Amino acid sequence: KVFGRCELAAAMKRHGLDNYRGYSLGNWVCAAKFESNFNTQATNRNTDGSTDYGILQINSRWWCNDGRTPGSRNLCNIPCSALLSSDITASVNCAKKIVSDGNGMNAWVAWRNRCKGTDVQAWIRGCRL
Known about the structure:
Layout: H1 5-14, H2 25-36, E1 43-45, E2 51-53, E3 58-59, H3 89-99, H4 109-114
Antiparallel strand pairs: 1-2, 2-3
GO biological process, one term: cell wall macromolecule catabolic process
Subcellular location: Secreted
InterPro entries: Glyco_hydro_22, Glyco_hydro_22_CS, Glyco_hydro_22_lys, Lysozyme-like_dom_sf
């Protein structure tokens, strides 16, 4: 599924991401835009052989099991394919565990490089929230 901007904001808000560990909703919408272009089916292979999955490009090295990242962990206790669903519940629940591990949203390179320090409220402007 390819979300609209306000459609995704509303889904993320419903799932409890607004102000989660202090990150306002515009941060999460900005990260999804630049990680996946709002596409739940996005995948990208990394140099180390791991793969990033879904609307927030969660890494198989630490967070989900895809059966082909040897010596990896499955900290969210899910198959990586569950992160590609049109239902964002599994991605959101796993993202909550990532953002709580100490590094905040700095775990998402696109957030650090393209959202952090910008006017992230612009990403929810105009939406029915």
